[PDB]
């Protein structure tokens, strides 16, 4: 269960395929509206190796749908997120997450 | 039962005897060998005696008929009361020298450690019971050593204080049930004014020294404070006050106390529970030993953290325990962490709670990652 | 609201400044797992902006700098800081290039001192490890206490060190103007938090050679010239800032000491090569000396017949010029050594004006000036400055105390050394944290990595200089202290430390000798661990004195006093750990008694020959405390040793008394086997306490008296009866099922081997009739029993192997002795 | 082995360098002499360029040496169960002790010069609280033998050489007004922990040298490691030398103080405890005689044992002389 709303469309023809890493600037927020994670504060692109499941499932399968240069808003359910165990001291248990993902480039 | 006990036992208050002669006037005259005098244990208020059914014991002052309780000090063991002198007397017995033999004057017997030693004393410490032997052994001579005025005064304070709180306790549980309604109280009136005054006296007795004092004077006052606190705990005053909080805590509000003891006792309920918490904090503040005593019943203080009549007092008690004893920290569980955090949620933004939380992570430069994980698990992710 | 509003809303300022303290409390002392979590609450941008915010209040500014240090820098700084006390110098060409003084033209005896901390250092320090924070990464499938150890959160250090340098430069120039609005509210709040960050970056080695030059210029601009801008030593600082300044000078003094050590190691590298070459050439010349010399060649070949350590000692033994004759070195080599000695003393300021001209005169002058300017109040400040002053005056003393931790290694072993230092840093990091399951698996694999490391065997001296055994000892002792009465939590780690310590003892005698000094330390902590099975803290003591003469002789009497008192308690009280598991109660602890006995067995028997002094002390203690022998051998109300054996044999073969009966626990205690094995150990200890035969032949009084005591304590007939006792032999049958007994709960051959030894050493065999009488009842059934077992089926069984060892090591050599 | 074993030039470079390092430090660094104590205390005893305002306040500002002594007195007066080892206090105490003594018919007038210089050199320290500091560290050590208490005793002797009257008066004043029993309790415990001659230890030493074992990294022949009989003989010597210097010069005021403490709550007889140690020493010597009664010649180690045992007996007898002279 994931919902993706476009904030600003990008290309729409180059989609993230297996073999090339995906380079993003995301901004994760809790459902109450309290930001918990971002990449622009660290001021470094978050390059994650798509297909190897090293990131959370919701982010992984929501990044596939959106294309290059697209600012997209996600909504990851706890099932596709950390769930009942949650993240210790960061994310409360059984929480729905929202991500302001932007894939500025594929490598 | 009297013993020739050893070790650190007779740096406490239980080994202090007061030489009480048979003469009122000139009762502090210089001791002369072989003159009658009683023996009194200051902290218990009992006199050395030769009873018929248990030999050499300590008897209450109500039944010291001066025959079984008189004693004499003698330089040698040969068989020997003189005429009183209206003056300072002749200086005969010295402190730290002049080996004395204590002989009961009415019976002629001699004090001696008991020879038999059972299975308990086979491995345990030899608590040699004192028996007033008919002739006595050879090395049973005694030195006499003075105790400082601080210790003697303190010792008398426990003996008076114990009686005043034991009497308070008995009055308290006398009306444990039996709702008064609209009539008179259950029995004798509670010594409320006496207890309140005694608490305010002990709180000032145990007040921590000021920071402006010079380091040399300050440390000596620390020694005086630690010694007095340890003497009180070792004599059981700390347990007695713990019972006092236990008895008082069963009633939720002052009106609820009024329904069981009277309307006149309702006004002093809040004051007398605050004073008890302040006394407990002063009795335990800075002592590793006294703070360690809460490691067994740590839930007793944590469970009271939600009471509103005295919230700062119990919080101060908890803070004093945690800042001093690391062994208390290892007893801390998720129940306690979720209880302390609830105080932040219920009693407002009290920074002293954050001080308690800070003290729960590191104690004496050693981290406790179990407590660190529980705190960051329960406090941080909620963001509320 | 704006965070700058807290400069007036003091009600919330206290709460927030304490909140930051709580943040440093949770992530304190290397809790990098929590430190990653805090990066979500306070971001890197938030931190950097709060670094730059000049209008932030005092407590919040200092709290935010300390929070940045706590989250990102303290774990790496601490781990590095521990490693700054050791100097492991590899032999590399860059190490060779290191010299005491820079190449210049000031003076031959001493050029100008190089800039402290500026140059190249070849000492080994493991690199830092950081993990960038990513909160969207998938949860690891590894469970708690099994996942790899978390690293500290990352942060750009090139930018952080540039911001820090710029910030301190601004503060230095701001202080000269003496404005009425210092940053943060006060001079202390402006300079102390920044200097903490600068000190941390120096310790972590972040700053380069140029950056250190900048810091030296900003501290004192004219002293540190290489060839309002007022230096930090002339701005009338308060006491709190001076403490950080003393920490700065402490770091530079440490850098100077490391420079001296590295220079000395470089000169060692060059001088050994020239000494080896000269001593080889002189050896070759000595091989041709037989054609023109005489009987005085013994002196010149004394060196080559003497082990190398004193060869260097006599080679270098020409300092005072009164003994040059014994030294065979040529004058050019001797001059070279005394040249390096002269500038070494000049560098250390021994012997070769408002200008200090270097660090050593600078520090001493400013420390004295600080002390005489005002009555210094802070005790830590006073201690720091007088430690700096003591180092500068006793410049050579700190070096002399620094050489024992110095060491040189081959250039081909650095990559192994790095892994060793990393594991040692992991162990050192556990000295400040309460032990838990997570740290338990961290150090079991850290120790295993040390065992897997070849340097741990190649250089036992280096492990002793690093104090690896000391740290493992303190880690073990802390856990033994935890739950010292109820039960010792985490037994798996304790038996791994004790296993490591035993393997440390077996490497060399010096490792064993160093381990011996903590014998009393081990003994008083070994009173409870015997319930734990495997390698106990007592086993460390046993391997600490195993098979060594001078150590066994040096073993103090009071250590045996502690052991016998522990044994008496074992023989006098029941084991509470055994009680709680539903075991039937007996008034003494056999397993604990046995574990003390086998240690005494190791103490009184070295290399097959009894140690007479320890044997006599042990038997005198045992006779003085009869409860050490147990319920039997007590005299009044006690049965005989034999009656205790058939009683134990019946208990062993009869369940519902051998144990709870409800190995089944895979370490199950059996009271039947425990009692017999305790008495076997007691007898074997007395047997090895018996005097050697040559003392009896010499007719020594004490030897006769002691053997008379052992004869009185243990009568001969009961010994022969126990040797004569039958043994449960495995039986063949039930369609080929080789049924075997439970040797963990039954009579074993080793109990007989313990009885045979005592008979051999105390009573012996003198006459034929008694010899045959011992045979036909005690030995002859045993040889026929093993005769039957030796076949195609039972030979490989456990009982058969036990009988083989029992005969070939206890009975058959005795028969060979008594052949005539 | 020695005829055929490896020569020096065939060792690995790193191992050979390690041997060179330990040989160099033992032969050229330990042997080196560096007298810096005089120029340390000289700098620390100057309070300069602070008299421009010429203020009249009694305390002014303590000079750096006084501040250092105050700091060590503070860390000795603090309440702690056990006295931890301060390596810097050990170094500064050794520096202070070495900065006083600094040490064929000398004329009586020039004889008076070195003494009257020594009194000044002691007066540079004892006017700054070092006399009270020594008493505090002795009381603080609680009777635990170590190099911590040893360096305090050495400093006390260094400021008490020649029986300084001012130092003995200041020390007596401090004990009499403080009225604490920790000082004599620690002194009594220290004296009761002093060792005597041990035959069992000696026989173990003899058999240990009978083995003559050798190490691996080269070889040490007849190693001179710590003797296990009268190891603390030097500490017992300067403990009694400190006690003797306290009573030296016929200080009848302090001689009575050792015998009995008027102000204190508990009285400890140092004279009796000194006798009891003397008995333990002579018992050791008497039991050492009977071991050599059968033998005719006394070997070298037995000589060195008698030399140190008798030097300790000398210091005890001199102290017992000083306790009663005057009379």
UniProtKB/Swiss-Prot annotation, chain A:
Q: Which UniProt keywords are listed?
A: Cytoplasm, Isomerase, Rotamase, Sarcoplasmic reticulum
Q: How does it assemble?
A: Identified in a complex composed of RYR2, FKBP1B, PKA catalytic subunit, PRKAR2A, AKAP6, and the protein phosphatases PP2A and PP1. Interacts directly with RYR2.
Name under which the protein is recorded: Peptidyl-prolyl cis-trans isomerase FKBP1B
Tell me, what controls this protein's activity?
A: Inhibited by both FK506 and rapamycin.
Q: Which gene encodes it?
A: FKBP1B
Q: Which reaction does it catalyse?
A: [protein]-peptidylproline (omega=180) = [protein]-peptidylproline (omega=0)
Q: Which organism is it from?
A: Homo sapiens (Human)
Ranges of residues in domain PPIase FKBP-type? 19-107
Task: Report the GO terms under cellular component.
Answer: calcium channel complex; cytoplasm; membrane; sarcoplasmic reticulum membrane; Z disc
Disulfide cross-links:
none
Instruction: State where the protein is found.
Output: Cytoplasm; Sarcoplasmic reticulum
Curated annotation (Swiss-Prot), chain B:
An additional note in the Swiss-Prot or TrEMBL entry is: Binding of [3H]ryanodine indicates that the heterozygous channel is activated by Ca(2+) concentrations 4-fold lower than normal. Single-cell analysis of cotransfected cells shows a significantly increased resting cytoplasmic Ca(2+) level and a significantly reduced luminal Ca(2+) level.
Query: Where would I find the MIR domain in this sequence?
Result: 28-88, 90-148
Subunit comment: Homotetramer. Can also form heterotetramers with RYR2. Identified in a complex composed of RYR1, PDE4D, PKA, FKBP1A and protein phosphatase 1 (PP1). Repeated very high-level exercise decreases interaction with PDE4D and protein phosphatase 1 (PP1). Interacts with CALM; CALM with bound calcium inhibits the RYR1 channel activity. Interacts with S100A1. Interacts with FKBP1A; this stabilizes the closed conformation of the channel. Interacts with CACNA1S; interaction with CACNA1S is important for activation of the RYR1 channel. Interacts with CACNB1.
Name this polypeptide is given = Ryanodine receptor 1
What is the stated purpose of this protein?
Cytosolic calcium-activated calcium channel that mediates the release of Ca(2+) from the sarcoplasmic reticulum into the cytosol and thereby plays a key role in triggering muscle contraction following depolarization of T-tubules. Repeated very high-level exercise increases the open probability of the channel and leads to Ca(2+) leaking into the cytoplasm. Can also mediate the release of Ca(2+) from intracellular stores in neurons, and may thereby promote prolonged Ca(2+) signaling in the brain. Required for normal embryonic development of muscle fibers and skeletal muscle.
Where found, per UniProt? Sarcoplasmic reticulum membrane
Q: Which family does it belong to?
A: Belongs to the ryanodine receptor (TC 1.A.3.1) family. RYR1 subfamily.
Curated annotation (Swiss-Prot), chain C:
Within the intact protein, the region shown is 1648 to 2567 of 5037
Localization recorded for this chain is: Sarcoplasmic reticulum membrane
What does changing residue 433 to M do?
Answer: Decreases threshold for channel activation by K(+), caffeine and 4-chloro-m-cresol. Decreases inhibition by Mg(2+)
**Subunit note:** Homotetramer. Can also form heterotetramers with RYR2. Identified in a complex composed of RYR1, PDE4D, PKA, FKBP1A and protein phosphatase 1 (PP1). Repeated very high-level exercise decreases interaction with PDE4D and protein phosphatase 1 (PP1). Interacts with CALM; CALM with bound calcium inhibits the RYR1 channel activity. Interacts with S100A1. Interacts with FKBP1A; this stabilizes the closed conformation of the channel. Interacts with CACNA1S; interaction with CACNA1S is important for activation of the RYR1 channel. Interacts with CACNB1.
Q: What else is known?
A: Binding of [3H]ryanodine indicates that the heterozygous channel is activated by Ca(2+) concentrations 4-fold lower than normal. Single-cell analysis of cotransfected cells shows a significantly increased resting cytoplasmic Ca(2+) level and a significantly reduced luminal Ca(2+) level.
- In which tissues is this gene expressed? Detected in skeletal muscle (at protein level). Fast- or slow-twitch skeletal muscle.
What is the similarity comment for this entry?
Belongs to the ryanodine receptor (TC 1.A.3.1) family. RYR1 subfamily.
Q: Which residues carry this modification: Phosphoserine?
A: 610
Q: What is known of its domains?
A: The calcium release channel activity resides in the C-terminal region while the remaining part of the protein constitutes the 'foot' structure spanning the junctional gap between the sarcoplasmic reticulum (SR) and the T-tubule. Pore opening is mediated via the cytoplasmic calcium-binding domains that mediate a small rotation of the channel-forming transmembrane regions that then leads to channel opening.
Q: What is this protein called?
A: Ryanodine receptor 1
What PTMs does it carry? The N-terminus is blocked.
């Amino acid at each position: 269960g994931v919902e993706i709303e476009t904030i600003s469309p990008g290309d729409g023809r180059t989609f993230p395929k297996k073999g090339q890493t995906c380079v993003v600037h995301y901004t994760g927020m809790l459902q109450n509206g309290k930001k918990f994670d971002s990449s622009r504060d660290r001021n470094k692109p978050f390059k994650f190796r798509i297909g190897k499941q090293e990131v959370i499932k919701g982010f992984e399968e929501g990044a596939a749908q959106m294309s290059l240069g697209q600012r997209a808003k996600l909504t990851c359910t706890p099932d596709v997120a950390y769930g009942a165990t949650g993240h210790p001291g960061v994310i409360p248990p059984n929480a729905t997450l929202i991500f302001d993902v932007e894939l500025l480039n594929l490598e | 039962l009297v013993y020739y006990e050893g070790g650190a036992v007779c740096t406490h208050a239980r080994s202090l005897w007061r030489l009480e002669p048979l003469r009122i006037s000139w009762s502090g005259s210089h001791l002369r060998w072989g003159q009658p005098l009683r023996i009194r244990h200051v902290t218990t208020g009992r006199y050395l005696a030769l009873t018929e059914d248990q030999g050499l014991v300590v008897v209450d002052a109500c039944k010291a008929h001066t025959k079984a309780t008189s004693f004499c000090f003698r330089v040698s063991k040969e068989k020997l009361p003189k005429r009183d002198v209206e003056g300072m007397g002749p200086p005969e017995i010295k402190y730290g020298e002049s080996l004395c033999f204590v002989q009961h004057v009415a019976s002629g017997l001699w004090l001696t450690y008991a020879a038999p030693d059972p299975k308990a004393l086979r491995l345990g410490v030899l608590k040699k019971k004192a028996i007033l032997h008919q002739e006595g052994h050879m090395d049973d001579a005694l030195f006499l050593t003075r105790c400082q005025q601080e210790e003697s005064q303190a010792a008398r304070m426990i003996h008076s204080t114990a009686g005043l709180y034991n009497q308070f306790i008995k009055g308290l549980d006398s009306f444990s049930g039996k709702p008064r309604g609209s009539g008179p109280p259950a029995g004798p009136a509670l010594p409320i004014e006496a207890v309140i005054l005694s608490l305010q006296d002990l709180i000032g007795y145990f007040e921590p020294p000021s920071e402006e004092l010079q380091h040399e004077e300050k440390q000596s006052k620390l020694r005086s404070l630690r010694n007095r606190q340890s003497l009180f705990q070792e004599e059981g005053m700390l347990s007695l006050v713990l019972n006092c909080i236990d008895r008082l805590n069963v009633y939720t509000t002052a009106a609820h106390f009024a329904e069981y003891a009277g309307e006149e006792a309702a006004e002093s309920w809040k004051e007398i529970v605050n004073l008890l918490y302040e006394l407990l904090a002063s009795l335990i503040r800075g002592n590793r030993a006294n703070c360690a005593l809460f490691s067994t019943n740590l839930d007793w203080v944590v469970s009271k953290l939600d009471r509103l009549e005295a919230s700062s007092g119990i919080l101060e008690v908890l803070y004093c325990v945690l800042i001093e004893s690391p062994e208390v920290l290892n007893i801390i569980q998720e129940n306690h962490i979720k209880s302390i955090i609830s105080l932040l949620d219920k009693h407002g933004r009290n920074h002293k709670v954050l001080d308690v939380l800070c003290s729960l992570c590191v104690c004496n430069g050693v981290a406790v990652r179990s407590n660190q994980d529980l705190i960051t698990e329960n406090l941080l992710p909620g963001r509320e | 609201m704006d965070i700058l509003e807290l400069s007036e809303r003091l009600d919330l300022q206290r709460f927030h400044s304490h909140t930051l303290r709580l943040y440093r409390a949770v992530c304190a002392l290397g809790n990098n797992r929590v430190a990653h979590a805090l990066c979500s609450h306070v971001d890197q941008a938030q931190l950097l902006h709060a670094l730059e915010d000049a209008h932030l209040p005092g407590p919040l500014r200092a709290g935010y700098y300390d929070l940045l240090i706590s989250i990102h820098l303290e774990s790496a700084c601490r781990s590095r800081r521990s490693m700054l006390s050791e100097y492991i110098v590899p032999l590399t060409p860059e190490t060779r290039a290191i010299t005491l003084f820079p190449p210049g033209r000031k003076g031959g005896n001493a050029r100008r001192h190089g800039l402290p901390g500026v140059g190249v250092t070849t000492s080994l320090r493991p690199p830092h490890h950081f993990s960038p924070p990513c909160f969207v990464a998938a949860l690891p499938a590894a469970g708690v206490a099994e996942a790899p150890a978390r690293l500290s959160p990352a942060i750009p250090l090139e930018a952080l060190r540039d911001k820090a340098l710029r910030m301190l430069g601004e503060a230095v120039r701001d202080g000269g103007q003496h404005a009425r609005d210092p940053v943060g509210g006060s001079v202390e709040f402006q300079f102390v938090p920044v200097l903490k960050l600068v000190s941390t970056l120096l310790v972590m080695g972040i700053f380069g050679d140029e950056d250190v030059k900048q810091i030296l210029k900003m501290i004192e601009p004219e002293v540190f010239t290489e060839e309002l801008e007022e230096g930090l030593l002339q701005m009338k600082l308060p006491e709190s800032v001076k403490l950080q300044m003393c920490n700065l000078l402490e770091y530079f003094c440490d850098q100077e000491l490391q420079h001296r050590v590295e220079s000395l190691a470089a000169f060692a590298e060059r001088y050994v090569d020239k000494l080896q070459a000269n001593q080889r050439s002189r050896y070759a010349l000595l091989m041709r000396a037989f054609t023109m010399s005489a009987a005085e060649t013994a002196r010149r070949t004394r060196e080559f017949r003497s082990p190398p350590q004193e060869q260097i000692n006599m080679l270098l033994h020409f300092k005072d010029e009164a003994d040059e004759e014994d030294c065979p070195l040529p004058e050019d080599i001797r001059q070279d050594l005394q040249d390096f000695h002269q500038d070494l003393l000049a560098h250390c300021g021994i012997q070769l004006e408002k200008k200090p001209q270097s660090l050593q005169e600078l520090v001493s002058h400013m420390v004295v000036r600080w002390a005489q300017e005002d009555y210094v109040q802070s005790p830590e400040l006073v201690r720091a400055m007088f430690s700096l002053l003591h180092r500068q005056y006793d410049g050579l003393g700190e070096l002399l105390r620094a050489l024992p931790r110095a060491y040189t290694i081959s250039p081909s072993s650095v990559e192994d050394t790095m892994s060793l230092l990393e594991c040692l840093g992991q162990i050192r990091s556990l000295l400040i944290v309460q032990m838990g399951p997570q740290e338990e698996n961290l150090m079991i694999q850290s120790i295993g990595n040390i065992m897997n490391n070849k340097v741990f065997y190649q250089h036992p001296n280096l492990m002793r200089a690093l104090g690896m055994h000391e740290t493992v000892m303190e880690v073990m002792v802390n856990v033994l202290g935890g739950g010292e009465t109820k039960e010792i939590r985490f037994p798996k780690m304790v038996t791994s430390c004790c296993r490591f310590l035993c393997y440390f003892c077996r490497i060399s005698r010096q490792n064993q000798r160093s381990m011996f000094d903590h014998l009393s330390y081990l003994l008083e902590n070994s009173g409870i661990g015997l319930g734990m099975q495997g390698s106990t803290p007592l086993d460390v003591a046993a391997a600490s004195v195993i098979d060594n003469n001078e150590l066994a002789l040096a073993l103090q009497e009071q250590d045996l006093e502690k052991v016998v008192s522990y044994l008496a308690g074992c023989g006098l009280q029941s084991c509470p750990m055994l009680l709680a598991k539903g075991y039937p109660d007996i008034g003494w602890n056999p397993c604990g008694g046995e574990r003390y006995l086998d240690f005494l067995r190791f103490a009184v028997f070295v290399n097959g020959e009894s140690v007479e002094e320890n044997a006599n002390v042990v038997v005198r203690l045992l006779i003085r405390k009869p409860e050490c022998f147990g319920p039997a051998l007590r005299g009044e109300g006690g049965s005989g040793l034999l009656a205790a054996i058939e009683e134990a044999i019946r208990i062993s073969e009869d369940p519902a008394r051998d144990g709870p009966g409800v190995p089944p626990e895979e370490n199950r205690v059996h009271l039947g086997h425990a009692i017999m094995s305790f008495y076997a150990a007691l007898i074997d200890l007395l047997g090895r306490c018996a005097p050697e035969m040559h003392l009896i032949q010499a007719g020594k009084g004490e030897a006769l008296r002691i053997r008379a005591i052992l004869r009185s304590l243990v009568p001969l007939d009961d010994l022969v009866g126990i040797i004569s006792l039958p043994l449960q032999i495995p039986t063949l049958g039930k369609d080929g099922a080789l049924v075997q007994p439970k040797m963990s709960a039954s009579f074993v051959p080793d109990h007989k081997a313990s009885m045979v030894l005592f008979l051999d050493r105390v009573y012996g065999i003198e006459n034929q009739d008694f010899l045959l009488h011992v045979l036909d009842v005690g030995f002859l059934p045993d040889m026929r029993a093993a005769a039957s077992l030796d076949t195609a089926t039972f030979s490989t069984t456990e009982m058969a192997l036990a009988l083989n060892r029992y005969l070939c090591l206890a009975v058959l050599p005795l028969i060979t002795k008594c052949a005539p | 082995a020695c005829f055929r074993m490896t020569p020096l030039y065939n060792l690995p470079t790193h191992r050979a360098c390690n041997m060179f390092l330990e040989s160099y430090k033992a032969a050229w660094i330990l042997t080196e002499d560096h007298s810096f104590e005089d120029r340390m205390i000289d700098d620390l005893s100057k309070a300069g360029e602070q008299e421009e305002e010429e203020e009249e306040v009694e305390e002014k500002k303590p000079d750096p040496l006084h501040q250092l002594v105050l700091h060590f007195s503070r860390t000795a007066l603090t309440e702690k169960s056990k006295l931890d080892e301060d390596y810097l206090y050990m170094a500064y105490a050794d520096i202070m002790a070495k900065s006083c003594h600094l040490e064929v018919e000398v004329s009586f007038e020039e004889k008076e010069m070195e003494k009257q210089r020594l009194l000044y050199q002691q007066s540079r320290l004892h006017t700054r609280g070092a006399a009270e500091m020594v008493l505090q560290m002795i009381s603080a050590c609680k009777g635990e033998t170590g190099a911590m208490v040893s360096s305090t005793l050495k400093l006390g002797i260094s400021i008490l050489n020649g029986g300084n009257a001012e130092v003995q008066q200041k020390m007596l004043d401090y004990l009499k007004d403080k009225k604490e029993v920790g000082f004599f309790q620690s002194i009594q415990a220290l004296m009761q922990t002093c060792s005597v001659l041990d035959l069992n230890a000696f026989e173990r030493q003899n058999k240990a040298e009978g083995l003559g074992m050798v190490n691996e990294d080269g070889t040490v022949i007849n190693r001179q490691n710590g003797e296990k009989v009268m190891a603390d003989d030097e500490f017992t010597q300067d403990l009694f030398r400190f006690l003797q210097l306290l009573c030296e010069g016929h200080n009848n005021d302090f001689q009575n103080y050792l015998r009995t403490q008027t102000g204190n709550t508990t009285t400890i007889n140092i004279i009796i405890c000194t006798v009891d140690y003397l008995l333990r020493l002579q018992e050791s010597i008497s039991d050492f005689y009977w071991y050599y009664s059968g033998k005719d010649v006394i070997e070298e180690q037995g000589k060195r044992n008698f030399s140190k045992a008798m030097s300790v007996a000398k210091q005890v007898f001199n102290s017992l002389t000083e306790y009663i002279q005057g009379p």
